[PDB]
């Protein structure tokens, strides 16, 4: 499945200084939800991803 | 043919099946309320669930 070994951090990393990264990164924000309406009634929630 | 040999005629009778007549209906009945009944309760879901 010509596995797939992929590259990873710095493990090692001490002082060191990545090079593209910013790209390479993505903060976790996240927008949405989660919300039900049971009865004629709605149960609501979000996402609060912390 | 479907009785095997031939041939239809007239004649042959046959006696009565009535048992079973009172009691498939019985299972014929029911089905049909509740696909009536259910249809409307169906219907009316105030809430999605159970529906």
Known sequence: ?50 | ELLGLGQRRERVRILKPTVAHAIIQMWYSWFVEDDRTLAAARRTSRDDAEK
Do not use: G, M
């Open chain 1, 1 to 50: 499945v010509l596995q797939a070994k992929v590259l990873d951090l710095a493990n090692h990393t001490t002082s060191i200084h990545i090079w593209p990264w910013h790209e390479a990164s993505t903060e976790f924000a996240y927008e949405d939800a989660y919300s039900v309406t049971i009865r004629n009634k709605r149960y609501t929630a979000e996402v609060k991803e912390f």
